[PDB]
Structure formats: structure tokens, C-alpha cells
Coordinates of C-alpha atoms in Angstrom, one line a residue:
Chain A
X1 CA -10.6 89.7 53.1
X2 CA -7.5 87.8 54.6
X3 CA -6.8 86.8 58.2
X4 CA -4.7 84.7 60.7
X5 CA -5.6 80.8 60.6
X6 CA -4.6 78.6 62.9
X7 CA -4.4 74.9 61.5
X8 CA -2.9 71.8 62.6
X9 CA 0.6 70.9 61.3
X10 CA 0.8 69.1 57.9
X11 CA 3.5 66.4 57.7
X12 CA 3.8 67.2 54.0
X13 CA 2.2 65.1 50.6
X14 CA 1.6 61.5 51.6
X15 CA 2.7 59.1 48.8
X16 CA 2.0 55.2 49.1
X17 CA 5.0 53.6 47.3
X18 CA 3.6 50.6 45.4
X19 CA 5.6 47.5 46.8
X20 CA 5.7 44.2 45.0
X21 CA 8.2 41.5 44.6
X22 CA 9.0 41.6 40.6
X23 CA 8.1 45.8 40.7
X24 CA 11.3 47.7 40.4
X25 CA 11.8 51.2 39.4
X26 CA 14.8 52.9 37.5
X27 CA 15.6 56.8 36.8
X28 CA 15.3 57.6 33.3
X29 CA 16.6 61.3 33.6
X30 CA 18.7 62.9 36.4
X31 CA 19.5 66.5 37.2
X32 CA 22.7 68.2 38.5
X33 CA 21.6 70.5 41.6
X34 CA 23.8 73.1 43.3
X35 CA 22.9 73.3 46.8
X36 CA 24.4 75.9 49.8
X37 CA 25.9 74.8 53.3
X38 CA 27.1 77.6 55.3
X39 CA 28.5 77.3 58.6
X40 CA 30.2 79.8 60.6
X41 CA 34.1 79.5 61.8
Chain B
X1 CA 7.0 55.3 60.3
X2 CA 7.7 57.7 57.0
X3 CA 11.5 56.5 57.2
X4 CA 10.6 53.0 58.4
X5 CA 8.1 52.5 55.1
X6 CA 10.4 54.3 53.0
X7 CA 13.3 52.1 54.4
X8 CA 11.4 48.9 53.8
X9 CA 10.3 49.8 50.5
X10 CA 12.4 52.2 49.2
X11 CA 15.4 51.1 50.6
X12 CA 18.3 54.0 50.2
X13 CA 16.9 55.6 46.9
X14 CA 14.4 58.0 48.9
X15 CA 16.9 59.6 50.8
X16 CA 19.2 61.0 47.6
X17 CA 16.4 61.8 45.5
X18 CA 12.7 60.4 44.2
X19 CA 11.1 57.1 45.7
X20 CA 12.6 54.1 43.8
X21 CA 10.2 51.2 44.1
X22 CA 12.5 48.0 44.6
X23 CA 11.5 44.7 46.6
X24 CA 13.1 44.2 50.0
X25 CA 14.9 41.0 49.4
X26 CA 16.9 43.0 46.2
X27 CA 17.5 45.4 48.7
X28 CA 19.8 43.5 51.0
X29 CA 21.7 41.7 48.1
X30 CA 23.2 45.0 47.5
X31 CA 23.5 46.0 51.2
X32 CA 26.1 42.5 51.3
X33 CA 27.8 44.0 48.0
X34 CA 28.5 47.1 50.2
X35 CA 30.2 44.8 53.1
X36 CA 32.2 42.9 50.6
X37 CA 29.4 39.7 50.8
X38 CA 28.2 38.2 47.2
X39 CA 24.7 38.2 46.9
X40 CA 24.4 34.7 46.4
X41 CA 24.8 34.0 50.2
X42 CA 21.4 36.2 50.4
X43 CA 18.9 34.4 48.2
X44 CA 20.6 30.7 49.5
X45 CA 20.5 31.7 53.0
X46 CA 17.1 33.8 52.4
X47 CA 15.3 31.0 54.9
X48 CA 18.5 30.9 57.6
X49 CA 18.5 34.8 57.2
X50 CA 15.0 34.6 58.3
X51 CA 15.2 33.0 61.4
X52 CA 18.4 34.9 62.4
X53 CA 16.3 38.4 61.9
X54 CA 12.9 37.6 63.3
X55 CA 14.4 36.1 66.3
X56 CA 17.0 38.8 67.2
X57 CA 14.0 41.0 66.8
X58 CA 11.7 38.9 69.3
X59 CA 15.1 38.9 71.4
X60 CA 15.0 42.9 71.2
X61 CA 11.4 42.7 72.9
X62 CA 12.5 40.3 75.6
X63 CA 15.5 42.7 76.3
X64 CA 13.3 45.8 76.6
X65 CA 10.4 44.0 78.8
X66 CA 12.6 42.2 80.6
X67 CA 15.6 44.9 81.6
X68 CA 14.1 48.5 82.1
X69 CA 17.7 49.8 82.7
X70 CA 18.5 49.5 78.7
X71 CA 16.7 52.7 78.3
X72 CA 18.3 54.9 81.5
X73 CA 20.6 57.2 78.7
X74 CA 17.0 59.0 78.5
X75 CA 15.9 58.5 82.0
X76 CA 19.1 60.4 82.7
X77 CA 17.8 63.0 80.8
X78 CA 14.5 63.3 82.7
X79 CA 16.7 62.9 86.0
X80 CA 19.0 65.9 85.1
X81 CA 15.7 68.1 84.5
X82 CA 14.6 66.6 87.8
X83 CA 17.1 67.6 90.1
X84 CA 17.3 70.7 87.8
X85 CA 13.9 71.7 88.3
X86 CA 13.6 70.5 92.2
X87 CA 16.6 72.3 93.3
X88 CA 15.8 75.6 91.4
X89 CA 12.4 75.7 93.8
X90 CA 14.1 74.6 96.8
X91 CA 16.3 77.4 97.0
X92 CA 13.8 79.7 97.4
X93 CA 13.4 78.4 101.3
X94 CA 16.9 79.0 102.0
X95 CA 17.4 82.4 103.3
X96 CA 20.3 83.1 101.6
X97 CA 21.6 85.3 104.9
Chain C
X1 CA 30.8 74.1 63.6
X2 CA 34.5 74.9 62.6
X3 CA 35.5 71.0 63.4
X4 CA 32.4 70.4 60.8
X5 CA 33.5 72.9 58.3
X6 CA 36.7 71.5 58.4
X7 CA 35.3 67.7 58.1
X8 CA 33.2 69.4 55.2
X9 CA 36.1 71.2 53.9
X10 CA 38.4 68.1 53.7
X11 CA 35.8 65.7 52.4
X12 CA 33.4 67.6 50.2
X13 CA 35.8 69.6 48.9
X14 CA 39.6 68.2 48.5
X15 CA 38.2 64.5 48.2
X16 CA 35.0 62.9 47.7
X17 CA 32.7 61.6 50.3
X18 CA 30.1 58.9 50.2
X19 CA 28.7 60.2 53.4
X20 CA 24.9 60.8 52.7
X21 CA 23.3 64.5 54.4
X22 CA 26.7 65.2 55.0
X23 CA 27.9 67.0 51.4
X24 CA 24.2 68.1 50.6
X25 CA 21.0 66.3 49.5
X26 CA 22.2 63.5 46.7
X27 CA 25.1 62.1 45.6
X28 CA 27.8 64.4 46.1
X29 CA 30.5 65.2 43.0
X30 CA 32.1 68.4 43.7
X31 CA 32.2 71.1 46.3
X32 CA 33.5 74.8 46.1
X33 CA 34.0 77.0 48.9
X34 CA 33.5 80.8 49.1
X35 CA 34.6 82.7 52.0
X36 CA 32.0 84.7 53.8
X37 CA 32.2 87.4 56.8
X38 CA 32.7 85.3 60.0
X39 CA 32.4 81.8 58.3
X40 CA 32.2 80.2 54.6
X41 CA 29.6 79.2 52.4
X42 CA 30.0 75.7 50.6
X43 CA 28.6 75.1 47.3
X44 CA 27.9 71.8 46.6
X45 CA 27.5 70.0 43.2
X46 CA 24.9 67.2 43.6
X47 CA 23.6 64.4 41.4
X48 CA 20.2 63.5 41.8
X49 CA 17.2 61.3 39.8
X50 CA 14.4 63.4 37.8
X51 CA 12.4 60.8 35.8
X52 CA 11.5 57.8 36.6
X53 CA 9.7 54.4 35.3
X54 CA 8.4 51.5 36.7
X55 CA 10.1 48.0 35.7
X56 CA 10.0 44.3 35.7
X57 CA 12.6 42.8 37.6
X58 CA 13.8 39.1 38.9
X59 CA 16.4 37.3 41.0
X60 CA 18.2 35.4 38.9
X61 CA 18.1 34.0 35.1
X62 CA 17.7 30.6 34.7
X63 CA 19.4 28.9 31.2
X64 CA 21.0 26.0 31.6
X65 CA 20.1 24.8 34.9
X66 CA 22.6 27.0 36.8
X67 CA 21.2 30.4 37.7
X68 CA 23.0 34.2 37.1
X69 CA 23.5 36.9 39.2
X70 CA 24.3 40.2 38.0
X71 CA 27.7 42.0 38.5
X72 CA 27.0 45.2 38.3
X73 CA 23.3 46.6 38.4
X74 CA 20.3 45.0 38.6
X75 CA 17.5 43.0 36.1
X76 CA 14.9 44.7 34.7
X77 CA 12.5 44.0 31.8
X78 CA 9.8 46.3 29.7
X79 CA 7.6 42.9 29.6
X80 CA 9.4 41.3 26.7
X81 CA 13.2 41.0 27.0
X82 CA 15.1 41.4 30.1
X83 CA 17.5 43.7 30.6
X84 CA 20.2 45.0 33.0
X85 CA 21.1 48.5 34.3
X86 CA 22.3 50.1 36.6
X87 CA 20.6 51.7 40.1
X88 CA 21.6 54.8 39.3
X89 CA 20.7 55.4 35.9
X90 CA 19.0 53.4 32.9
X91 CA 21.3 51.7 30.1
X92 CA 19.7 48.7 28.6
X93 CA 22.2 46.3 28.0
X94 CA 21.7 42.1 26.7
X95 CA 22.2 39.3 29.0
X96 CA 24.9 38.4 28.9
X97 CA 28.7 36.0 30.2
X98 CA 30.5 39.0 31.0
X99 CA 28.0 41.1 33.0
X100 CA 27.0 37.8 35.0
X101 CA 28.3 34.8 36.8
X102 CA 27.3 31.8 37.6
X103 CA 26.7 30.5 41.0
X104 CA 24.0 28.1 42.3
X105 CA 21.2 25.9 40.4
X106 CA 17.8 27.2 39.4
X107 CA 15.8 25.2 42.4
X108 CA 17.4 27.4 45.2
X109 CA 16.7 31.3 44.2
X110 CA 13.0 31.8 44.7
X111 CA 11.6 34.0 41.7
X112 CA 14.0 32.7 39.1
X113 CA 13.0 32.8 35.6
X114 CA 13.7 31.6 32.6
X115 CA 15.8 33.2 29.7
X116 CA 18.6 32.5 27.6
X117 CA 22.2 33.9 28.2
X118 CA 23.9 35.6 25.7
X119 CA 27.9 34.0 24.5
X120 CA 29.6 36.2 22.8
X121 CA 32.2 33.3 22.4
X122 CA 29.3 31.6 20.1
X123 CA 29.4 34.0 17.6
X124 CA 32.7 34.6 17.1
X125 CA 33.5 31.1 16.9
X126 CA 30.4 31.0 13.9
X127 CA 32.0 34.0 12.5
X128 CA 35.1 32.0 12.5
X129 CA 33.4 28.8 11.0
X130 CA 31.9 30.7 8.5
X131 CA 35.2 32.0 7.6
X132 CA 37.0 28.5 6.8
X133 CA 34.0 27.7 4.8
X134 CA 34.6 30.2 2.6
X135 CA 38.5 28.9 2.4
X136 CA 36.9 25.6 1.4
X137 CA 34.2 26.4 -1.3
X138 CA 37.8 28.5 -3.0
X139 CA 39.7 25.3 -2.7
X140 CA 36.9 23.5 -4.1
X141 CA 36.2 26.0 -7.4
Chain D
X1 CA 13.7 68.5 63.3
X2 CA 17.5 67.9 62.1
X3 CA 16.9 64.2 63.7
X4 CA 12.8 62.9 63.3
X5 CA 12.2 63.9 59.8
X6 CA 14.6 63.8 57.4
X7 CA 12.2 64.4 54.0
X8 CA 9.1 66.3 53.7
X9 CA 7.6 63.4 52.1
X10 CA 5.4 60.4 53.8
X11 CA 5.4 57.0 53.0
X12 CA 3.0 54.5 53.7
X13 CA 3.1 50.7 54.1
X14 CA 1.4 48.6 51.7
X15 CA -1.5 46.2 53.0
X16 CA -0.1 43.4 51.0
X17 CA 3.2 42.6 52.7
X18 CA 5.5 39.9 51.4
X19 CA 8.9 40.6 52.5
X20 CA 10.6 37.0 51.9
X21 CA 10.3 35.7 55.1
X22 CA 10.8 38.7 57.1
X23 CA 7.8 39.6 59.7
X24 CA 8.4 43.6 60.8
X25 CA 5.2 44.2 62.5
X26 CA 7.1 44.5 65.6
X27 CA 8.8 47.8 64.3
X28 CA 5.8 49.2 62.4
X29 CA 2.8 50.9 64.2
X30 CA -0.4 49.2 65.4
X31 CA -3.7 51.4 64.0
X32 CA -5.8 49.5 66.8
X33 CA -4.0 51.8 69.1
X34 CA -5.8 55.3 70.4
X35 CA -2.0 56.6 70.0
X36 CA 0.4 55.6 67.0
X37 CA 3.1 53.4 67.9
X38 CA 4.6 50.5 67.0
X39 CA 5.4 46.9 69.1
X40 CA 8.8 48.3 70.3
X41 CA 8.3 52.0 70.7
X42 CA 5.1 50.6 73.1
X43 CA 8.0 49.2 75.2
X44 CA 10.3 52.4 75.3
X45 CA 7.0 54.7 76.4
X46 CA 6.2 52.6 79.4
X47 CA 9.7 51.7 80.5
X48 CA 10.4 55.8 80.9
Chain E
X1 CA 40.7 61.8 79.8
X2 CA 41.9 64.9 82.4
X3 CA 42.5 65.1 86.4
X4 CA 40.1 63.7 88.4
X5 CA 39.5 66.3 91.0
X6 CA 36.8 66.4 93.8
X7 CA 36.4 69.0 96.5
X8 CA 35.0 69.2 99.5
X9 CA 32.6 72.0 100.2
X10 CA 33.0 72.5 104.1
X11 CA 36.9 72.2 104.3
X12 CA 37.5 74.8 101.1
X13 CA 35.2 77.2 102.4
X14 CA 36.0 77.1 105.9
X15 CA 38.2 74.1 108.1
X16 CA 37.5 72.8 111.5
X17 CA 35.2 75.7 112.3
X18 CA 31.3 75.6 113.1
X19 CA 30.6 78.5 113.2
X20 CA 30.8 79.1 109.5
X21 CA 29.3 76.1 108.8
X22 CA 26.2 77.3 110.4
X23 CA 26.1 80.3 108.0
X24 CA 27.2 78.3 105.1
X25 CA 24.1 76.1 105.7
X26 CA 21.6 79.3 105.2
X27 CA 22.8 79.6 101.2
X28 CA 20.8 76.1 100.2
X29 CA 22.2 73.5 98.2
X30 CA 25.2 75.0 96.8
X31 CA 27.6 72.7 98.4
X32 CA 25.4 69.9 96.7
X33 CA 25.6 71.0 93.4
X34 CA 28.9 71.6 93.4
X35 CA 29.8 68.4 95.0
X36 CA 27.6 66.5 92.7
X37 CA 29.0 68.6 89.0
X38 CA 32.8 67.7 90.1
X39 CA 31.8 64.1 91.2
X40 CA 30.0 63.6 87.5
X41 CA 33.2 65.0 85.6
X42 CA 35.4 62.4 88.1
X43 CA 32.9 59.9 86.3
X44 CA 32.7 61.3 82.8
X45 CA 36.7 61.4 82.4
X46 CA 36.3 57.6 83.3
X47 CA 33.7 56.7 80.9
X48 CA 36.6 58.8 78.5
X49 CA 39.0 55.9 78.9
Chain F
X1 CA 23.7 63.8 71.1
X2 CA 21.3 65.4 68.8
X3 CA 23.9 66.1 65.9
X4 CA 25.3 62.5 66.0
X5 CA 21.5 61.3 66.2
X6 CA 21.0 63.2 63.1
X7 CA 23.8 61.9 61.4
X8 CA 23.4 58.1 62.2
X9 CA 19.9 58.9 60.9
X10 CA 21.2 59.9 57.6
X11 CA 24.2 57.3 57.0
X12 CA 23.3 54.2 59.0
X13 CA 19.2 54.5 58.5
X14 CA 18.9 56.1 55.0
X15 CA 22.1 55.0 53.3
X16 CA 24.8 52.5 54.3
X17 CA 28.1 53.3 56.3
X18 CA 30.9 51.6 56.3
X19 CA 32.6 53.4 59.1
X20 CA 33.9 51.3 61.7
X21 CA 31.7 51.0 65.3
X22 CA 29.8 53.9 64.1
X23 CA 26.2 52.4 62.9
X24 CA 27.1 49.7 66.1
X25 CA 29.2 46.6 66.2
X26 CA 30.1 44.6 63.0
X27 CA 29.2 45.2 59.4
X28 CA 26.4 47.3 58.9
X29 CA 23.5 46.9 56.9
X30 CA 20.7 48.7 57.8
X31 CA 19.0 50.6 60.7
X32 CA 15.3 51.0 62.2
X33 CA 14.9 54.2 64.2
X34 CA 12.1 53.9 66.9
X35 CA 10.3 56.8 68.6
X36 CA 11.2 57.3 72.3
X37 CA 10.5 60.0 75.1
X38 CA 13.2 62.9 74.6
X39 CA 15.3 60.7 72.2
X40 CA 15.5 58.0 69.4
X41 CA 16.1 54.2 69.5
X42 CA 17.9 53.0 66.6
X43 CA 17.8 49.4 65.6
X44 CA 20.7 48.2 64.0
X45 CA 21.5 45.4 62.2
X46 CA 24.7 43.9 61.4
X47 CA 26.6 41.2 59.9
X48 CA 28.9 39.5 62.1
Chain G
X1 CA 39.0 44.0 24.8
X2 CA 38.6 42.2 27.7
X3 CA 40.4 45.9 29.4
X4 CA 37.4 48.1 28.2
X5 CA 34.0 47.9 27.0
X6 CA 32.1 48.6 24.0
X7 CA 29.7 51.5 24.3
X8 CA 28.3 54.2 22.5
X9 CA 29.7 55.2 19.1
X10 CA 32.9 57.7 18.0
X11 CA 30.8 60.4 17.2
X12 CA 29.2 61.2 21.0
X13 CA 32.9 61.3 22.8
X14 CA 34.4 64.8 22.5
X15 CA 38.2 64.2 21.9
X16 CA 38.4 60.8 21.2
X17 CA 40.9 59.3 19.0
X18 CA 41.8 56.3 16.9
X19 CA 43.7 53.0 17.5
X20 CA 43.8 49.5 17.4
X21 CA 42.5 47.3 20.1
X22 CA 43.9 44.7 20.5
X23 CA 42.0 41.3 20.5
X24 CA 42.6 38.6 22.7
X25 CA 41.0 35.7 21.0
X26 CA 42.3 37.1 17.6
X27 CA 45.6 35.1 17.9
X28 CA 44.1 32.0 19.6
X29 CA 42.0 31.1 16.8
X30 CA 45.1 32.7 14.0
X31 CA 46.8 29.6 16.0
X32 CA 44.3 27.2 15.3
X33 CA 43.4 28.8 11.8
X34 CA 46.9 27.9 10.2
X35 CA 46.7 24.1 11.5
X36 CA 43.0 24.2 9.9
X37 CA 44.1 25.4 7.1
X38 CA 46.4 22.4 6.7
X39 CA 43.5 20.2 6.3
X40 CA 42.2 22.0 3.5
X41 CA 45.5 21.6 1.6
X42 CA 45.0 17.6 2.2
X43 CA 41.6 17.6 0.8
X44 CA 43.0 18.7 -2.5
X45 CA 45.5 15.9 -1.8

């Protein structure tokens, strides 16, 4: 019972960042990610 | 306006990782540590700094309305496709021999 | 795109660039090529945030009428003591001479607050009071 | 794609706005608008 | 910057004749493009310097 | 055009370069990108 | 001291190894310490 849809494009999540003048935020945790570039030469 | 809110909020956190909340004015303290400029000529100058930004901004405007030939790198761009496009159809009345 | 892989090859790899996109998403650390048919592949080592938390921050630090500015990092506070860290990472540390300077007066910086700043020279110069008054209750017995 | 959006992510600007002094209502977008665009990119449509 | 070069579409094809000009007329515009793709490099190698 | 668009949109609009005359004349600081017909318009300010 | 920082203890670091570091203020309050301690030989006086 699936099909083709046809939707309008989604921009992705949208996240309001809280912004005030004494608010700050600092990572508590980080993570080492391994990523791939290729190019051709 | 995602980069421009991000920008003004989140400064250069969002663009290596997660959204880092920080306020605007922090922001460009360490924007001068990154020119070589203590960050005590930010929050002293904070009120000169804010006439030097708001008016080179209204001067941005009265460049734009004023001069329309600011923008011709793109109306070069519409030209090329012009006399792209133009030519293309007119050579279909030339008889080629 | 060989003039890139190059630039990529030079910077990424050999050195270390600050150039943001450029190396990969994050901040860049290490890069290690692997040849490929017609091209290479470039595997890049990237640090990135994963948790974070929202803090209290301010300006400057008022004590003795001057205010402080941090040297490294920025102010931050769980609602009781304030701390300072760095951007990229959270290390509680105490107010302190050494990780500020002073510069200004507290009427100037808008959103200034009051604390007290931290001399390590106090301490060691009690330590060392302390010290001779131990010499003097043995000259005294 | 490689140039307009960089992160999958959207931000959005708070209705509280204190920026120290700064005013950057020029360079955000009006929502009075029928299209979305801000005080300067309302300049760069009509002067193409 | 390179050689700035600019050629003439009636004298390469053909000098001091009108009768070939008359047939070179019939192929359209290809004397303008030309002219014009030369005269922007001419421009181009300036904007180099 | 496109490829140096999308680098000044990483470097002189997310981060902070200090190349020289690449985010635009003096020290950089940051950059506003504006929407504009078959391009971008970037913003930059500098310290001079 | 004033050429490193405290942080963290011996335990955590994977190789490290012991020495002396050397205190800058040690000797500029030693210098002070011995004319102090001339005053307490006077009070006995």
C-alpha cells in the first residue's frame, strides 16, 4: 500500500536558539569524527 | 536568514558543530582577539562601535538605492544569457547558403 | 580539482589548517590520504562538540573598582560561583590574577558584576607568616 | 547548494532583540512582506 | 596577463573583395560573436593586471 | 564564481579568516550574506 | 612555575615523570626570611 508523493521541499528541523545577554553555552563532551573528501586528479 | 540568525546568535560555533548560545557583544570580543585587538577596546568603544556599524549599514542602503551599477557583476550574467539566448534564435533567419 | 587536492593535500595533510569547510566539517586535527583509481580519497580527523549546557556568563568582574577581562576563555557561572573555561571545551577553573588582567574601571563595561579575585600571592605570603610564627612561639618556649 | 545552505539546520531570530546597540533589521527579513526578504536584499531584487 | 589579439572578421576571411562579403553576410552573426569573444578576452587580460 | 562563493561562505561568514584581501579590504571580522538574483551579496565588515 | 601550570594529578598523564619545579618566589622570600629571622634573635636579646 505504498506510492509516489510529491511534497514541498523541507529546509530541514527548525531550532530557535535562545538568545540572551548573560545566556552562554559551553560543550561538555566532544566527539572525534572521521569524515571522507574525495576529489579526482 | 538560517546563517544570518545563526551568525547573530550563534556566532562561529554552528558551523563546526552544535548551536552554542553566546550573546552578540561576547562575540566580537573574540572576533578582535582574532585580529590581534584586546577586547577591552570592544566593551569601551561598545557606543562609538555603534554608530560606526549602524551607519555604514544605512550608508550600504544609500549606495544600493542610489547607484544601480553596484550590482552589474550579476546583470552581466543576465546579459551573457541575453545575447546567448537572442543570438541562438536569430540564426535561424540567416540562410546559412 | 587537482589545484584543490593539492591545496588539501598541503594543508590538511602535511600542516594544519584553520580553514573552516575546507579540511571537513569541525575542527580539523589530522588528515590521511589514500590513493584511489583516477583520484584520492582524503580522510580527515575532525574534532567536534557532543554535549552541551547552558551557562551564566558576564563581561567583566568587578573587585576592587577596576574590572577583569579574561585571557583565555570566557566567564561562565552554574548560579553560584563564577567560573572560567574555555570555548571549546569545559574546565572550571577559580578567578583568578593569572588567568585575568586588569584594564578599565567598573563604570565603563555594561553588565559587570561583582566578585572577588583570587591572589595566589595572598596565600603564600600567609603561608609564609604563618611559618615565622612558628620560629617565634620556639624562640619563645 | 555548495553556496546558500551550508547546514541542514534553521535558525530563527528571537522576538526579544538586544544586541548592545546594534540595530540589524536592515539585513534580517520583513514578515509583512508577501515574499521573504530583508531591507537590503529588497534593494538587490529591484535593481536587477 | 597574455597577448591581446583582436581580428577582424571581413579582412581574415576574405580582403578587399565584395563579393565574398555578400556570401559571408548569409551565415548570421558569426562575425559578431567572434568579434565580440576576442574583444572580451582583450578586456579580461586587462582586468588580469 | 560559485566555488569561491562557497568558500567565502564558509571562512569569512561562518568562521573568521585572516587571509589577506580575501573576506574584502582590512581586518576581517565578520560577514552578512544577502540573497540576490543568480548570485549572493556578501556584507563584510572590517576593521580598518 | 610561572613556565607551566598546575592541572590534573600524576596519576592521569601516561609517561609522566618526576622533578623539581623550580619556584620563583621560593628564593625571594628565603631572602627576606634570613633578615626576619634576625629579628627573632634580637627579641631574645
Amino acid at each position: 500500500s505504498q506510492s509516489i508523493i510529491a511534497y514541498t521541499m523541507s529546509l530541514g528541523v527548525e531550532n530557535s536558539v535562545a538568545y540572551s545577554n548573560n545566556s552562554i553555552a559551553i560543550p561538555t563532551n566532544f566527539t572525534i569524527s572521521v569524515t571522507t573528501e574525495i576529489l579526482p586528479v | 536568514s538560517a546563517l544570518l540568525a545563526g551568525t547573530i546568535t550563534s556566532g562561529w560555533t554552528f558551523g563546526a558543530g552544535a548551536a552554542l548560545q553566546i550573546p552578540f557583544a561576547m562575540q566580537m570580543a573574540y572576533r578582535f582577539n582574532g585580529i590581534g585587538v584586546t577586547q577591552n577596546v570592544l566593551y569601551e568603544n561598545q557606543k562609538l562601535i555603534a554608530n560606526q556599524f549602524n551607519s555604514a549599514i544605512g550608508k550600504i542602503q544609500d549606495s544600493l538605492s542610489s547607484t544601480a551599477s553596484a550590482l552589474g557583476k550579476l546583470q552581466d550574467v543576465v546579459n551573457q544569457n541575453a545575447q546567448a539566448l537572442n543570438t541562438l534564435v536569430k540564426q535561424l533567419s540567416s540562410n546559412f547558403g | 580539482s587537482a589545484n584543490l587536492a593539492a591545496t588539501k593535500m598541503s594543508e590538511c595533510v602535511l600542516g594544519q589548517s584553520k580553514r573552516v569547510d575546507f579540511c571537513g566539517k569541525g575542527y580539523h586535527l589530522m588528515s590521511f590520504p589514500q590513493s584511489a583509481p583516477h583520484g584520492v580519497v582524503f580522510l580527515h580527523v575532525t574534532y567536534v562538540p557532543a554535549q552541551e549546557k547552558n551557562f551564566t556568563t558576564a563581561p567583566a568582574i568587578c573587585h576592587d573598582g577596576k574590572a577583569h577581562f579574561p585571557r583565555e576563555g570566557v566567564f561562565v557561572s552554574n548560579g553560584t560561583h563564577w567560573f572560567v573555561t574555555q570555548r571549546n571545551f569545559y574546565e572550571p577553573q577559580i578567578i583568578t590574577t593569572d588567568n585575568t588582567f586588569v584594564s578599565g574601571n567598573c563604570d565603563v563595561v555594561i553588565g559587570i558584576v561583582n566578585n572577588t579575585v583570587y591572589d595566589p600571592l595572598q596565600p603564600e605570603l600567609d603561608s609564609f607568616k604563618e611559618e615565622l610564627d612558628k620560629y617565634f612561639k620556639n624562640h619563645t618556649s | 547548494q555548495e553556496v546558500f545552505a551550508q547546514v541542514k539546520q534553521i535558525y530563527k531570530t528571537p522576538p526579544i532583540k538586544d544586541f548592545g546597540g546594534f540595530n540589524f533589521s536592515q539585513i534580517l527579513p520583513d514578515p509583512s512582506k508577501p515574499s521573504k526578504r530583508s531591507f537590503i536584499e529588497d534593494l538587490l531584487f529591484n535593481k536587477v | 596577463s597574455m597577448t591581446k589579439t583582436s581580428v577582424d572578421c571581413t579582412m581574415y576571411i576574405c580582403g578587399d573583395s565584395t563579393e565574398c562579403s555578400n556570401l559571408l553576410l548569409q551565415y548570421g552573426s558569426f562575425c559578431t560573436q567572434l568579434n565580440r569573444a576576442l574583444t572580451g578576452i582583450a578586456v579580461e587580460q586587462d582586468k588580469n593586471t
